[PDB]
Paper text:
In this work, [name] from rat (r-[name]), which is a phospho­diesterase producing the lipid-signalling molecule lysophosphatidic acid (LPA), has been used as a challenging case study. [name] is the main producer of LPA, forming the [name]–LPA signalling axis with LPA acting as a multifunctional lipid mediator by engagement with six dedicated G-protein-coupled receptors (LPA1–6). [name] regulates many pathophysiological processes [e.g. vascular development, neuropathy pain, fibrosis, rheumatoid arthritis, sclerosis and cancer]. The X-ray structure of r-[name] (MW 100 kDa) has already been determined through conventional cryo-MX, giving a good control over crystallization, with minimal optimization to obtain sitting drops containing micro-crystals. r-[name] was expressed using a stable HEK293T cell line and 800 ml of cell culture yielded purified protein with a final concentration of ∼4 mg ml−1, which is inadequate for batch crystallization.
In addition, we determined the r-[name] structure using cryo-[name] by collecting 10° wedges on many micro-crystals via the Mesh&Collect strategy. This served as a reference structure that was used for comparison with the iSX model. Interestingly, on visual inspection of Bragg reflections from the iSX dataset in 3D reciprocal volume, the data appeared to be complete up to 3 Å. Similar to the cryo-[name] dataset, preferred orientation was not observed [Figs. S3(a)–S3(b)] in the iSX dataset, even though microcrystals were plate shaped.
Numbering used by the authors: 56 to 397, 401 to 571, 588 to 859
């Protein structure tokens, strides 16, 4: 019943006996002598010259006696002050080609150094503010920033780091959330979060344990000082082989707490950054002390950034809604609206939150209409009504929920939780160790990708997650995972002139009654259909398409627009022209009368007639197989994209290749719908209505080369535009399309990977680039930041 000899034990001693481990204070179960035996403080944390060779005093927090190296519990600077050694930060960086671990180490240990609220821009003030972190950054592997998940809150991001899952998949969709099945609420302050029912997926410490890899307990009670946390990881690393963990975790509540108090750019932020770097210095000094500084893989990682947010910048739903007392709001940098259950109508609530104030600093969303890149909808804990708060702003229920002590006060000057594309929300990643690359800069990536890497760093088979395994191979000098292209499931048909124009009774009227193009319009090979379906390849002068016979529309439409291409007007005799495609059966073609009968639905073309190379080739653009059902409100967005924006991108990027097509996601799970999951069709027909329309715009990273003659890395920008019957999302949609369309498309920017999940297609299968390069390209997100 005492902590003698079992201080910070890794053993699973539970209720009701008193424990002595990392979270005994959190579970309120420490033994009586835990503080006096395990949390010692005497003589501080740093050795002095007078303490060198001291008589061992069991009272002391750490020891400077000659025998302390044997015990593994020296102060982290013992060798520096006593044995005349240098600080790890003062040493010149030497490349770690192979792990230099003591005998008995079966794998290079992984220390995850989580820092709460560490903005990416905090690294700009380094070298002297953060000498130890700067050495890790410049001499290891770093990205300029790492993209967190939405919401950019602590618990959703830390668990995303641990599982590689979107919060909608691993369940921690917010710091606070309500589960209608549990009829209970989750909060980071409380005991309910310790209930395992809230945590889906498989975190890293569970993936490791299930595969015979010992994990140190990742979580530390706030009562434990950081020096004691580092000392405990160092003592754990001195355990025997059969007891020593292979993966550890240090969590710093800083610089989040000071960033919340003084804002990200405050001068009071350098002392916490110096404090964290001191802890980083203590870890590296301790590792070098244990001869582990060239054996351990250290990941310096943050969960999110920090934005200037003051209470003076708050939106109040009482200024929009008639009875906010009937509403439960998750307030702050994001908004989640629930029925309080004490006349609650989400349609009326959405309408009266939509573009009501001229500079409205939030936008309401039905969660299935949120930008798909956020992947924040497929969970019963995500409320149907969501508010995207503008950066630097808050949303609250009523004006009495804000709190300010003195005149014009605001207890906090910084906050986070915004859209994870926001640059202030970007956090840091530094990988230092034998498995990481030396002095290497990697492009920014999303924290959903780290779980795969940490599993690779530990020899672990990752649980199914939302990282693209292989996209971060360029961070590692050794790759345990070699990605392979998925097999094409459905082979394409290549129909000739099978049907006469006379056998068509589709109600279509038009006033006119091979590789040669693959080379030009299909630059990276045809997409692979990764599901069972019947579809045909259709060749034309200006575009190629994979036309689905089940969906009566192309799954994709590929075409290249040169830098010097010319945008022509639709000739007036062809304004309502839809010609039948003699290569496609009448039964597998759309009916033009179905669009007449459907008074809410119109139609558009995947390849734009505006970008036809000749008035003769323009007739192919009006084929029934280039036609997709489009709401007239969406046609405003699509026509502007097709007749102005594609040309603009071709003129800026020295030509572009465009792959456009429909997306069906009626259950908003981010995956392509089956035929039975499509909940809307064109009235009186089996023509399905897409929920989105994607486009993948690829060019040459070397803009001095045209898109069709590029012999190097590609540059991609993609979007998944919501196919909505109104433009309610765009508050300036009354104006010309040059004042709201491109802004709307930037908000719905997407990774090619997002489109692949949503379409069952695999792009970029025929390039001069390695597959790991392409996977990095597929996960790229053009943020417009
Ligand atoms: C992010 O990653 C998640 C985990 O990989 C994905 O969620 C998984 O979706 C799968 C398919 O919808 C589910 O898998 C199995 O589906 C078959 C259907 O044939 C069923 O028999 C199984 O019961 C079912 N899974 C089981 C046994 O639970 C997964 O359940 C589900 N996994 C999780 C953890 O949610 C997401 O789809 C992915 N997101 C995106 C956008 O790709
Ligand atoms: C208050 C803080 C200082 C510490 C908070 C700790 C808390 C978030 C941790 C402690 C134990 C964790 C669970 C445990 O490690 C095992 C599992 C099983 C795994 O399948 C899913 C995750 C889960 C439930 C962990 C969730 C996070 C917990 C409760
Ligand atoms: Ca779906
Ligand atoms: Na040919
Ligand atoms: Na119509
Ligand atoms: Na509008
Ligand atoms: Zn946090």
């Amino acid at each position: 019943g005492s902590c003698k000899g079992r201080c910070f034990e890794l053993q699973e001693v539970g209720p009701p006996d008193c424990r002595c481990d990392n979270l005994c204070k959190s579970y309120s179960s420490c033994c009586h002598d835990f503080d006096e035996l395990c949390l010692k403080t005497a003589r501080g944390w740093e050795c002095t010259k007078d303490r060198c060779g001291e008589v061992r005093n069991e009272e002391n927090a750490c020891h400077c006696s000659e025998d302390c190296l044997s015990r593994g519990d020296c102060c982290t600077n013992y060798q520096v002050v006593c044995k005349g050694e240098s600080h790890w930060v003062d040493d010149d960086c030497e490349e770690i080609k192979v792990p230099e671990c003591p005998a008995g180490f079966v794998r290079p240990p992984l220390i995850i150094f989580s820092v709460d609220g560490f903005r990416a821009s905090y690294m700009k003030k380094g070298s002297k503010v953060m000498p130890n972190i700067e050495k890790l950054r410049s001499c290891g592997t770093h990205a300029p920033y790492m993209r967190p998940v939405y919401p950019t809150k602590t618990f959703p991001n830390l668990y995303t780091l641990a599982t590689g899952l979107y919060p909608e998949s691993h369940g921690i969709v917010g710091n606070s959330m309500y589960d209608p099945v549990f009829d209970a609420s989750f909060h980071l302050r409380g005991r309910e979060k310790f209930n395992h029912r809230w945590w889906g997926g498989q975190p890293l410490w569970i993936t490791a344990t299930k595969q015979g890899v010992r994990a140190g307990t990742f979580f530390w009670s706030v009562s434990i000082p950081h020096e004691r946390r580092i000392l405990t990881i160092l003592q754990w690393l001195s355990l025997p082989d059969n007891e020593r963990p292979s993966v550890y975790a240090f969590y710093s509540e800083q610089p989040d707490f000071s960033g919340h108090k003084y804002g990200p750019f405050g001068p009071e932020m350098t002392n916490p950054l110096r404090e964290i770097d001191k802890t980083v210095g203590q870890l590296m000094d301790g590792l070098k002390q244990l001869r582990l500084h060239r054996c351990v893989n250290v990941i310096f990682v943050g969960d999110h950034g920090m934005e200037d947010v003051t209470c003076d910048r708050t939106e109040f739903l009482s200024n929009y809604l008639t009875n906010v007392d009937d509403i439960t709001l998750v307030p702050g940098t994001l908004g989640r609206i629930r029925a309080k259950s004490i006349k609650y109508d989400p349609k009326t609530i959405i309408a009266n939150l939509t573009c009501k104030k001229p500079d409205q600093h939030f936008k309401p969303y039905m969660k299935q209409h949120l930008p798909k890149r956020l992947h924040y909808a497929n969970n019963r804990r995500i409320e149907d009504i969501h508010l995207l708060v503008d950066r630097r702003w808050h949303v609250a229920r009523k004006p009495l929920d804000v709190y300010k002590k003195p005149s014009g006060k605001c207890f906090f000057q910084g906050d986070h939780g915004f859209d994870n594309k926001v640059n202030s929300m970007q956090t840091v990643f530094v990988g230092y160790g034998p498995t990481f690359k030396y002095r290497t800069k990697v492009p920014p990536f999303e924290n959903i990708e780290l779980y795969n890497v940490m599993c690779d760093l530990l020899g672990l088979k990752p649980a199914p997650n939302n990282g693209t395994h292989g996209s971060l191979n360029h961070l590692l000098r050794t790759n345990t995972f070699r990605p392979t292209m998925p097999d094409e499931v459905s082979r394409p048909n290549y129909p000739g002139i099978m049907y006469l124009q006379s056998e068509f009774d589709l109600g279509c009227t038009c006033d006119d009654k091979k590789g040669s193009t693959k080379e030009r319009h299909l630059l990276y090979g045809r997409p692979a259909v990764l599901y069972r379906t019947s579809y045909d390849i259709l060749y034309h002068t200006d575009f190629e398409s994979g036309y689905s016979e089940i969906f009566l529309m192309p799954l994709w439409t590929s075409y290249t627009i040169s830098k010097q291409a010319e945008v022509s007007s639709i000739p007036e005799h062809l304004t309502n022209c839809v010609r039948p495609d003699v290569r496609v059966s009448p039964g597998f073609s759309q009916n033009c009368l179905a669009y007449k009968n459907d008074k809410q639905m119109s139609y558009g073309f995947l390849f734009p007639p505006y970008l036809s190379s000749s008035p003769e080739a323009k007739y192919d653009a009006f084929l029934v197989t280039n036609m997709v059902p489009m709401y007239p409100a969406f046609k405003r967005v699509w026509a502007y994209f097709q007749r102005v924006l594609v040309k603009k991108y071709a003129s800026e990027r020295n030509g572009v290749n465009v792959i456009s097509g429909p997306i069906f996601d009626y259950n908003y799970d981010g995956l392509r719908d089956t035929e039975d999951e499509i909940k809307q069709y064109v009235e009186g027909s089996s023509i399905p209505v897409p929920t989105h329309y994607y486009s993948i715009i690829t060019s040459c990273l070397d803009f001095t080369q045209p898109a069709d003659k590029c012999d190097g890395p590609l540059s991609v920008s993609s979007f998944i535009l919501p196919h909505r019957p109104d433009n309610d999302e765009s508050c300036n949609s009354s104006e010309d399309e040059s004042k709201w369309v491109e802004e709307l498309m930037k908000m719905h920017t997407a990774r090619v990977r997002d489109i692949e999940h949503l379409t069952g297609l695999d792009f970029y299968r025929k390039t001069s680039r390695s597959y790991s390069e392409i996977l990095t390209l597929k996960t790229y997100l053009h943020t417009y930041e």
